[PDB]
Amino acid sequence: CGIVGIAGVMPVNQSIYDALTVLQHRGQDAAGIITIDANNCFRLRKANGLVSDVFEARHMQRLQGNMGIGHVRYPTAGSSSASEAQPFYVNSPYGITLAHNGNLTNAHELRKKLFEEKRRHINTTSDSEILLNIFASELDNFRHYPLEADNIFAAIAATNRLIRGAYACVAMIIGHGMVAFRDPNGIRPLVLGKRDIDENRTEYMVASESVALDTLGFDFLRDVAPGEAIYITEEGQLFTRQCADNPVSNPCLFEYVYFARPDSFIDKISVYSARVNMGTKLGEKIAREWEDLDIDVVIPIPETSCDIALEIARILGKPYRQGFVKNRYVGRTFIMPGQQLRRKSVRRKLNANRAEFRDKNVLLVDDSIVRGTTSEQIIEMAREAGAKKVYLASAAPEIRFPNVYGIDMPSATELIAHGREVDEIRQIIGADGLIFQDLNDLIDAVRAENPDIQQFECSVFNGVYVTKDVDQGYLDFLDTLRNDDAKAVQRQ
Amino acid sequence: CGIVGIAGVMPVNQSIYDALTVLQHRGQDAAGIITIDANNCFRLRKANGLVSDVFEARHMQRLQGNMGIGHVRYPTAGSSSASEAQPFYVNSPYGITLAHNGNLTNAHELRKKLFEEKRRHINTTSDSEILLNIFASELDNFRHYPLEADNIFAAIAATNRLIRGAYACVAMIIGHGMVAFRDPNGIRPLVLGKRDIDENRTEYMVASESVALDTLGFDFLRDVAPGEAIYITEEGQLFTRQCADNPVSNPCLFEYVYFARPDSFIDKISVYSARVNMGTKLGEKIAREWEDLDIDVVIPIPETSCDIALEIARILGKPYRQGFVKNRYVGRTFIMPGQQLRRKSVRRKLNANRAEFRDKNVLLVDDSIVRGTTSEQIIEMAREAGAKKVYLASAAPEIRFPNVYGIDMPSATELIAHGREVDEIRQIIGADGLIFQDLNDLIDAVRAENPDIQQFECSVFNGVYVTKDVDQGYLDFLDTLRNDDAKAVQRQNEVENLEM
Amino acid sequence: CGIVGIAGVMPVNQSIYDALTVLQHRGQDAAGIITIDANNCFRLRKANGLVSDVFEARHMQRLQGNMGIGHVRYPTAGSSSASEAQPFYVNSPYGITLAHNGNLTNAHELRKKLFEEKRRHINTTSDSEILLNIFASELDNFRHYPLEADNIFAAIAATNRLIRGAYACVAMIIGHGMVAFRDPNGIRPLVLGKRDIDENRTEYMVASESVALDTLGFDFLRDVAPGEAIYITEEGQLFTRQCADNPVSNPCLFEYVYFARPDSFIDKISVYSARVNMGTKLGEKIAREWEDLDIDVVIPIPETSCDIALEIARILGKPYRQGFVKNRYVGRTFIMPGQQLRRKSVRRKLNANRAEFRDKNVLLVDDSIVRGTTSEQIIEMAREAGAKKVYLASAAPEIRFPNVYGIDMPSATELIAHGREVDEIRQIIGADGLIFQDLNDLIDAVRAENPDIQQFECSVFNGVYVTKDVDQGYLDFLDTLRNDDAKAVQRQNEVENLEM
Amino acid sequence: CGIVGIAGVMPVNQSIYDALTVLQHRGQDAAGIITIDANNCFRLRKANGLVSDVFEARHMQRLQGNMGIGHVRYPTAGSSSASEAQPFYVNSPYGITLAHNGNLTNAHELRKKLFEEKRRHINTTSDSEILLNIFASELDNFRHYPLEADNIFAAIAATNRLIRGAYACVAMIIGHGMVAFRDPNGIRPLVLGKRDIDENRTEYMVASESVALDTLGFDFLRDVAPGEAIYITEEGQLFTRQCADNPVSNPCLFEYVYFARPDSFIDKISVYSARVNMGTKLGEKIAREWEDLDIDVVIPIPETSCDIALEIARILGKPYRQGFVKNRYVGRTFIMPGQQLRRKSVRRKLNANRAEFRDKNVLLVDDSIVRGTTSEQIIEMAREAGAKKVYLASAAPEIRFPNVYGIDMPSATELIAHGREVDEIRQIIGADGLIFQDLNDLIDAVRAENPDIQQFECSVFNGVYVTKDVDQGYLDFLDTLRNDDAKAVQRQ
């Protein structure tokens, strides 16, 4: 998911829309924009679809105001495609809206406590609605009006003591302003930027990725620190405060592999440079372990891998060729009467340049392997195009465990690497050779750009969950949610 | 524009839709699909928009049948977003539908003769509707039913003697089959493929590019020859015939520079390889001519130039770096009362990775320069990202003339290269240096993939039009068409706005 | 179906739209409007739905021009909701569009001759598309331009000798003007009106009913005579001509019973007065034949019967009371998994005021009885509301035959009156008593408004078809059309449902 | 506006939809349906438009559950066409949704108190959102779970002590059930019905009008009494309780004139029979005051007046004729480029049967006269059709004051009768004669059907507001709201 918040001095509707279009890769299922108008009321438009389809001129006209937040959703367990999108909203105390990228590992318990102690009903199964309700509940402990920055930060600090998981959040409180805060492990991405309008006016914005600041002409200030909260008043005054105990930087390593845009700088690391480094490490590993193999050409599987593969080919002294072309436009498959509904294909998303595989031993490079379904079909396509031996290299280590911090991953059972070694995975996908990046190599590739990061969030790779509250019982619970989400989406 | 025609033995609606999605880069303004159903009637769905938006379940349900054609439109003078899309249709004789990629340079005169001699009314400003009417009138000359293959080919031959310009067409005639044909100069692209089902039951397909054949699992047979026609009967039989007097192969060189997909093979030339060769030629030219310059990195301006720049970087022994990222998603800019601080036009398209430009003399590579406006903005973006020297290289030679063969290019006075030396263009765009591909090099780069092609359609580069009927009266007439189109688009907005 | 044609001196889009809204009762399945713009090209918008839903701002914006025609469709065999709506169009000769209300009893044969002799393909099952093609082919016989009025009338005359059935048509020919014409028997309705703007600048209009002229402020001139054609040039000149050999006035009697609006005057007969007279006749028949019965109140079954029942109540000296209220708004009944306790079909249409039936012998009045199914349900509703005796009177005589002249009626075996005595129908519907209007009385009731009309089109009542070409082979062919239409509508639902 | 609530034993989505289609005359601007699903969560669909356009198959599929409420909106001051439609919803305490037909005369003060004492933000300017927040605030005073019927009734009783105005309301509380309640003056209409499914199962429903019970096959039980509340549990148990002090029946007299359907029975009075009685009274008044006039025919102005006019013609011994035909389908007028946007017409809504006016002195009958604009044009049409003298009779007395209890009326200035006598009104509309029903006659016409009603709510006619809190200051306040609503709708 992707978030954006703009505390401006002029209408923000078009700017939030624009920022969301460059964060569109973070989620294409739904989009939502909410602003605070001249009457101190929220105006909201959220619906399923790409940003360009969700917001029509008439919705834009309704989104009045100089402060607003936006969200693009990537479906996850509990927040299916059929469910209510973000931002969520509550009417007490004061009027609060919140957008979130992440996941709370103790959502179910929080929901119980919200109901039993506060009589606050949660209408969806989205942990973001729960997060908003905890925050609201903490903001409701004040008698004086309006709230001071100290009270807002105290409410966030109290919220941080109650919830667990990963979260980059942005919210607005009517009559007060905008708040942005990050989990105490710095797992989900969140940067802060500013735009000087004149001598006395400065606008502020926060976004999941720095590309949103770039596209709008905002100057990058810094990443929001792990545990930190930022509060910008209605009036344009900026406050910041550390709202967690023992904060530490454990950025999600997966953002760097393929999730984030290459032109973003997350926790001082260029995603692009980290990806080139991944190719360097993988090339070095292949040159060492596959020294005797006959490889005629290195072909990336579009699109994140093109540069990684370029670096591999360079390290290996082999030619790099565009053997696969990603179909920029993909359409749907229709369930028609009488007609047999045939095959689910990768041919719909990819085309093989026939001449580039013919009578060659090819080394294909992909960013990662999850279910292994696409790689299987891709290898088959390489063979149909006339390839002799087909080898596959993965820029990421084996993906064996589920992500419960905001990245949608299928359950452990559906991860081909779960409970399987490299050779068995290779035989299943039908490759002549398979090699994965070593985790310590991926770490060094990213860390080379910012040696200050000591440890990253690596759970999908090593099964070590930093919040220490993930056991099989929880993972099974998450699966039941997926099952319910499936029934709902099936229904639509 | 892109076209596709499939004569199958099973339902074609989903396959035509899928073919158009991979041909979508040829035109995103509109799409249309028409099929012949079991009752020998046309079923049609066309509208503005991307293929994925134009066809919904209820439209696919009505598109029944085993034979059909499809089209995606790129708007050109006489065919604006405002006007009716393809494919077009006529009810006499027989019921004929056609789709076309190209342009008829004598459309005006054809429209007049059709009115005067045949009383055939043309409802739009589309030369494709005219092409269809000339074809339909030639088919109306027979007095026995059904028409024989030879009759249909004779009609196409008669049509080619009458019309002039460039065209790749696919059409269907109720009760007979599907026909496809290409202009006498092989300017516009068109390939044929097949898919065997069993003993003597094969499906055939034609499309603007071979990627459409690939995506559907059809075996590529070959390019439809210049001036040739293909006729596939409803019963699945194949016939072909040269229907032009002096066919020559003069493929549009623009398809290779950036219009077609790299994974396509057009007239036996891999588009990808040709582009890599364009990089080899341009890099050698740069090594020879810019020998004294210190360039720290080669940065492509997405998306067509990535492989060209990579090859240029290889020839120069310089690092290649992704300095610009193209925003995959672009939205609408709504006209709002007093749009305070508008987002820069260039930023809507691209984003610069600041680190890749900081304190570096950069060599940017773009596929071509037309108006020169976006080039100037990209150069600016680079200096803004911290570049010291900013050089620009164009994979295509100077674009100085309008294209009247189906590729949308502005008028000559609008082309920055028009009437200007490279150094003048350089000053205007603000580059520290500017260099273009030499035309003979571009030709060699593409010809290297198929030496049999001796001449390419190069008019945008040299002003030489193979149809020899392009004059100022014609260009001026095209400008008029463009003006009426602009008016039609302006009106459509006027109350889309007043409706609020 | 209803049609409208306006040849004005100022934009007609809004006026045609407004005219269709007051003609909306003639068909709510689809609507279409086509205009001739300043460049002599057709601009068209047609789709399923009510006029208010079919035409949005963006469609009206494209419907430019000072002359145009409109149509609203009531679905009939060969023209289902699934099929293409009117108006239809052809591009040769000249560019001709037509809209029609009626039905051609020899459509099949016409389609065959058009194919064989002219190679004219008919894409839909609509006899209106056929009518247009016959007209277009007759117009293709001249070799001088423009066509003279006499040429156009000669073409309409040729068409009338070829086609058979009932029809009110309005059409436009690019570069010439608008024509309107009526069948030789004056079966279907059509009136002409004018609106003076200044010295020798008058706008003309034709429509199915005079309410369309009223609503637009046009002065009513007269009914288009049986077999007559009207031609209004683009320059605003009026021409007319009898284009039929032996025209007779045999107005559809159904228009008067309930199809047309009461405020309309058709062939000089006020629909309202005719209906009041229908009440006078039926009330006198009831007073004579049901003299021994105790009826406490007369209750109309909304909406056409209110004034008829009022008059019947007047003749019987009995109170008239609103016992049923028609639900002005009816929604969709969604097919949901296990629809527990479905709302009664009859309740979707009407609601009974319990107080008006309680312990009363009620006389209900409906305009006609077709299948008899809703009649049985209404009777039930009344007993349920507490009525003791429930009697039913039909303003129309027994409906025993299908209509093949443009009014949608089921087949003969589907009409409850078919092959049954009044007492048998009575038992089936469950009424304590049933009485129908006598046909001669219905005729007198309408004729009283204009004694010049000596014969009406009565086929649904007497089985006598004026075109003398209705046989079982024809009826069976119509049933086939209806079946194919049903299949097309079923398919359209199949994945509207599977899309969820 | 119209409301409906169904506490069933099987899915209610289609039934609520159906009930709203027969209450559609109560408001065509927007419609909303909210149900409580099997998961104890609300599912909602509300939007601008007729009921048949607002709810598509996909929304119906989402509206799962055996309990639900619906609303159709008629735009009023503060709840413009551009504003959020009903039902409104709050997430604490427990989850409550409410739909309302009426208006609170002290909404502005309640909103202030909600903000200052409870920190509850009101996002629209709709008094229904405010009503829901007061109720929620009162329901939030309980510690034990779940709430007993006594607690729910206590919260409604407390709500009744705080708010003032007119209101027929229906609401649902998650985990509890459905509640329906009526203002202490019995101003806005609300009936209760039931449907026996079997020996142990009985469904209940409440609606603005009895026709909604009829169309669904529910048996009419009774009107909900002034001040009374009804609570039906999830489990199907019905409770009722008087929740106001000194309740009294003052039904809105205006519902009977033209607002309600003729087939409804409101406070034991048949709307149809009351309308015939109005014609009887008006006929008697005309036969007495216009004894010497030459009148050739009585012509009703469709559609509510057809029966009233029929009775008048009967009393006068004159023929009744259909001189005007209402166009059942009306379309919009388009703002096109270049074309002059001509006249706003009644000809779009009405057609004159020419033959029925020619050389006749006609007596036209309308249900009421508000702005006087339509009557002016109608009289003109009668003249164009050839009428000699044109007389107009109004089934309702002069409308001189604004309605602040739920019926949309323009401000005092726009009411032709405001500050004007009959003859001046007559001269303005251009009639040859004008006669209005006497208020005491209208009262007797309605009261004849239920002599138990002592006084009705007659403010639009006499300026006496039963809640005693309406002064010019308030009416001016209401106008400023209309002005803001206008700017919003203009904007769209």
Ligand SMILES: O=S(=O)(O)CCN1CCN(CCS(=O)(=O)O)CC1
């Ligand atoms: O942004 S807009 O105001 O235009 C749409 C508001 N949005 C519509 C969908 N519902 C959930 C439906 S349900 O889950 O209750 O069925 C959340 C609110």
Ligand SMILES: O=S(=O)(O)CCN1CCN(CCS(=O)(=O)O)CC1
């Ligand atoms: O904030 S604004 O006033 O601009 C928009 C108000 N918004 C419109 C959409 N509905 C839900 C639609 S649905 O969930 O019923 O489909 C919630 C209220």
